[PDB]
Amino acid sequence: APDLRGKIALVAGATRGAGRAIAVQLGAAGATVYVTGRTTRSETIEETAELVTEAGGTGIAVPTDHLVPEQVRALADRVDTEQGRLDVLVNDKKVWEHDLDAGLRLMRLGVDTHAISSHFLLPLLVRRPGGLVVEMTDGTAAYNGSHYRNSYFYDLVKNSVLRMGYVLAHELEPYGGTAVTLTPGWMRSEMMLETLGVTEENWRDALTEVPHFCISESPSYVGRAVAALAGDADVARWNGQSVSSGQLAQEYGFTDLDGSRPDCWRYLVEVQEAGKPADPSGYR
Amino acid sequence: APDLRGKIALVAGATRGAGRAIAVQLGAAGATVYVTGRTTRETIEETAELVTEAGGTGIAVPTDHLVPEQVRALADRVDTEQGRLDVLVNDVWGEFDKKVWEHDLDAGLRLMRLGVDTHAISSHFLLPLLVRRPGGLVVEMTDGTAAYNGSHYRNSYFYDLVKNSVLRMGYVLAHELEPYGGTAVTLTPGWMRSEMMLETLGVTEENWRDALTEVPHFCISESPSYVGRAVAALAGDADVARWNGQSVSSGQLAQEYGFTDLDGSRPDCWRYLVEVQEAGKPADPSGYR
């Protein structure tokens, strides 16, 4: 397990989902984790901060509207003020049938938030060599390169975030910084679980409803992937790359909480898209 | 030369640059071209007038492509006047030395909205008429090919994201159009001798090589009409669907279709940049145009 004691991390959008689990596993590795989000006081950013500390780290919730630049500027001044450093930064319809106002808003919320974040927080990170940026997305470059993702606006956002890691990787290298774009697999998120009417303790009950859900992973999986990167002294070998939680589980050797290693994106192509029946053998 | 007589085309953002040159070469191939832009009476009307003299029909529709109501009215007009849309070209566009945190943020966000949102609004309102019948063609204009951009950082954070988003737009639209018999590609010009480029170097088109002393690698440049002839070759290709979803360049299509620039050459900008300029070799167009 990575020893991240003394490290300063910030997870933008950590109220729920991968962001919370990422912040929590960073705290479990011993880091101080700034966690941001709009929903305040549990399904709150404060609850996220409390989970980071409970895990053995220090979680500091900073409520932020990441589309409001002055709020992200204030966020960046705060980490500098309190810490003086930042080691890890974590960020059915045709196009003409889709609702246009929603699609444009989706692209602004999914892309502009990352750009505003990098503009204000990257100066502190490149202040010393060794900083790491992880841009979170849905899918790998290899998968998204040959697959349309759900909708026009969704697809554009997720592939923009893929490019953001390549772009930042070129901008950060002269400072000794690293940027990657990371995706989870099929997450057993709090939202996903309630949608299937199950708890984490009894998640395979849903396999009758969704048989291919047998490849799913807990949110802590991609959280341990980030911790492995932030603890990697030669993490710069990944600079500019698109990576997945399952790919990094094979490289670093961590497991999900249940000890398995789901490999979602190979399963989707070789089994599910291949017309084969749901069968996790050899994929977790 | 392609015979596009009877074809109805629309070029979004056709006041100048590739968009004007594309609209003109479509009219020279016989098309009726709707040309849009904000700049009216170096105007969109001038673009329409140039389409007509070239042997076609240019119809200027001043449009703010960031205002959906205006783009919807534009789409209703083509249906009202023509009832069909065969070719749609998207060329709507809005700090080369700066990091994302050094760049001006408000400008960068405005750059991404003007360069990405305008294309999405355009596809939302105009694609229904285009997919009404098979054989429609969508051309999303960009800077660079997927092969080049995949291994090259492009100018700035915001610029890079915009141009690579439009590349993805061609792939995405290719999936949405296939059941309708429609085709989408993303096309880039080379280094265009645009009106802006020519004035920046203090030259005219008639004497453009005078600039080689100050910019030697400009020897690979092309006139705007080159990429215009690439669009016309696609729109005239009965088997254009073989390109569906692909990223293409003006020089690559010159090799495939056999057209030339106005001066009879075939600049291959993106191979030249990698094999000569980025390789440290001196500027020498031999074998690249």
Numbering used by the authors:
A (entry chain A): 9 to 49, 58 to 107, 119 to 311
B (entry chain D): 9 to 49, 59 to 111, 117 to 311
Per the authors:
As a family of DNA damaging genotoxins, THIQ antibiotics exhibit remarkably potent DNA alkylating activity through the departure of hydroxy group in hemiaminal moiety followed by an attack of N-2 of guanine in GC-rich region. Here we discover a self-defense strategy featuring with reductive inactivation of hemiaminal pharmacophore by short-chain dehydrogenases/reductases (SDRs) NapW and homW, which are integrated with the naphthyridinomycin biosynthetic pathway. When the cofactor NADPH is replaced by NADH, the enzymatic efficiency was dramatically decreased. These results strongly demonstrate that NapW and homW functionally catalyze the reductive inactivation of the highly reactive iminium species, which implied that the two SDR proteins may participate in self-protection from endogenous DNA alkylation. Collectively, these results unambiguously supported our proposal that the SDRs NapW and homW axiomatically endow cells resistance to NDM for self-protection.
The structure of NapW contains a typical Rossmann fold with seven β sheets embraced by α helices, which is the key feature of SDR family proteins for binding cofactors. The binding of cofactor NADP+ enables loop 47–58 and loop 107–119, which are too flexible to observe in apo-NapW structure, adopt stable conformation and are clearly observed.
